[PDB]
Amino acid sequence: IGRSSVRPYLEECTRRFQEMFDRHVVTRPTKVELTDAELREVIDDCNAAVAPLGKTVSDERWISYVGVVLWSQSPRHIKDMEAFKAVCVLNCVTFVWDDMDPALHDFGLFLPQLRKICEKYYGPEDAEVAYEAARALVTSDHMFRDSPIKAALCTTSPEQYFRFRVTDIGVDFWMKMSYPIYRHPEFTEHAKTSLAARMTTRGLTIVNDFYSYDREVSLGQITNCFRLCDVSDETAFKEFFQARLDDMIEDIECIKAFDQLTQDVFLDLIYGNFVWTTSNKR
Amino acid sequence: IGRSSVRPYLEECTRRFQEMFDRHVVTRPTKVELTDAELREVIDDCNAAVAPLGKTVSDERWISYVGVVLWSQSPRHIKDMEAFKAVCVLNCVTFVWDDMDPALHDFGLFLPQLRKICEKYYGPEDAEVAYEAARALVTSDHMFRDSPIKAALCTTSPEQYFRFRVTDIGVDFWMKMSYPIYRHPEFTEHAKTSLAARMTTRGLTIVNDFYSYDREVSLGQITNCFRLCDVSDETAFKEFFQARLDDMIEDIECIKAFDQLTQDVFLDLIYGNFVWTTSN
Ligand code: NA
Ligand code: NA
């Protein structure tokens, strides 16, 4: 990767992200703890869904995927643990699908597994909303592989890039499968209009992109907001990073105008995602 | 702000918007012609949908609303005229609902009517996608009236304002009811991810906001991007307006990376909306 690396800024940016969250969010993420029985159930369902694909995945690997759900949901407000388990399974199986060679992507085998998961854990209406979101995300992933549109949106400006990431980073899917956990009519509506996703996209994506940059550029991946700046130039990098923190701050201050429960969930998502992303486990 | 106006800029901004579309889109909108029978079918369904509200709407009002669909769809690519009629009806009855005293908003009576429209004109899955978009939009409006969240998103920055308008100005609804008109797999997916709405929100909202500004500020409505600048300050106004034209241009040039049918639809929507808005 040569000088296209954020390694020189890794510690300072980690410190600044945390400082920002401490100043602006205050409430520290907590990890939801599943019983051994609940985790086993989650993992069994994950294994079942990827079995048709001939994937064997260890518990260790599943638990490494699931941690983002354990850290980035909002334990204060959980009301439906069946829905919580659905989010665990769906998150994990999607990560596995995403890590597969796309030439092995058999949608005909995988999509009915997603449907079977949703029907197990959600009521009829919610199962359809979660399933459609999952189907929309994997379909978009397939459409945007080596696509000129992805190139155009990702390289034009931060505005076009984040617009693309509202779907691509997975947060619209996340919101559409997570609202049944909270049974909160306002949150449910913000999830369904995708306003929830639009509010949280930058705080999730900027953190994810920062910590994935070196790995991605080494693999020739273009979907990272830091590709819009000359990371090798400390002055240009610091300018850009400050602009991204300011974006995160503006979003967070606006999130604080939503009703209390909704803003707890949105902020626990953005902050919890950062805690997980930086964890030794991750 | 209550007595502000963009009247002094009306002619110049109209010319500039048109000049921009001529330079960046080139292909001009054309109006879909409904047969007499199709227009009567649309009007009859509109009337039926709003009848339970005790709402009496003139044919001329229906026609004034339906013109946005006739001008802003993409005639070169229309495949399914039943879907097209559904968008006519859904568009018109949502306008009428929007124009009513919200105290008269009986969702119990209105939502089953929207469901009936969707079930008449769309196949089963598309009927569900359209109805859910309609329901989300009208439920959103009800949640945001006088909400501190709307205030926050509309006054903070253009980024927050447009983010709110992806839903609030109706474009996500429009895409999710319009894809069955085209039956084009790529467009259908961009509509269902809402990328379609994200790409076209600024070009629709900046135009709608400019021409609705005087009416809206006089009614204390805060959902207008021009309230983010002092329209009484000519230099400030020109700077702001140029920034919004630059936003529209950037979205349009990015839209041209999409597949040809999809870009045709997106650009016909933004440019058609401008043509209808200026004639209505
Ligand atoms: Na948390
Ligand atoms: Na047109």
- DSSP per-residue string spanning B132-160: HHHHHHHHHHHHHTT-HHHHHHHHS-HHH
Of the listed ligands, the closest to the CA of B271 is 2
Q: Which ligand sits closest to the CA of B74?
A: 2
Token pair, residue A169, equals 């980073």
Q: Which residues of B are annotated as a binding site?
A: 98, 208, 212, 216
Starting from the CA of residue B264, give the closest ligand: 2
Resolution of the model in angstroms = 1.6
Tokens at B243, concatenated: 């920034």
Residue written as tokens 């400030």?
A: B236
- Alpha helices by DSSP H, chain A: 10-24, 36-50, 59-72, 81-99, 107-121, 124-144, 148-156, 158-168, 171-182, 185-192, 195-219, 234-255, 260-278
Compute the distance from residue B270 Cα to the ligand 2 centre, in Å.
9
From the CB of residue B188, how many other CB atoms can be counted at a distance below 10 Å? 21
**Residue type for A70, please?**
L
Question: CB-CB: which of A140, A198, A254 is closest to B193?
Answer: A140
Please answer whether residues B180 and B80 qualify as being in contact, where contact means their C-beta atoms are separated by less than 8 angstroms.
Answer: yes
A29 DSSP 8-state letter? P
- Span between the terminal Cα atoms of chain B, in Å: 25
Provide the shortest C-alpha distance from residue B143 to chain A (in Å): 8
CB within 8 Å: B198 and A159: no
Scan residues 130-159 of B and list those with Cβ closer than 8 Å to A: 132, 136-137, 139-140, 143, 148-149, 151-153, 156-157, 159
Give the distance from CA B119 to its chain's centroid.
Answer: 22
Q: Is A105 on the interface with B (CB under 8 A)?
A: no
Query: A260-278 and A171-182 helices cross at what angle (nearest 10)?
Result: 130
Among candidates B139, B208, B115, B134, which has minimal Cα distance to B177?
A: B134
Copy the structure tokens of residue A236: 């240009």
Among A152, A198, A253, whose Cβ lies nearest the Cβ of B163? A198
The annotation status of A253 as a binding-site residue, yes or no, is: no
Nearest chain A residue to B260 by CA distance is A149
**Nearest alpha carbon to residue A255 among B59, B101, B276, B156:** B156
Residue A147 three-state SS: coil
Domains of chain B: 1-280 (1.10.600.10)
**Looking at chain B, which residue has its C-alpha nearest residue A167?**
B193
CB-based contact A199 B166, cutoff 8 Å: no
Residue B167 has a CB neighbour count (10 Å cut-off) of: 26
Nearest to A30 by CA among A252, A281, A267: A267
Of A161, A231, A145, A239, whose CA–CA distance to A201 is shortest? A161
Q: Could you tell me the CA-to-CA distances from A132 to A22, A74, A139, B121, B128 in Å, in that order?
A: 36, 23, 10, 21, 11
CA distance A116 to A49: 9
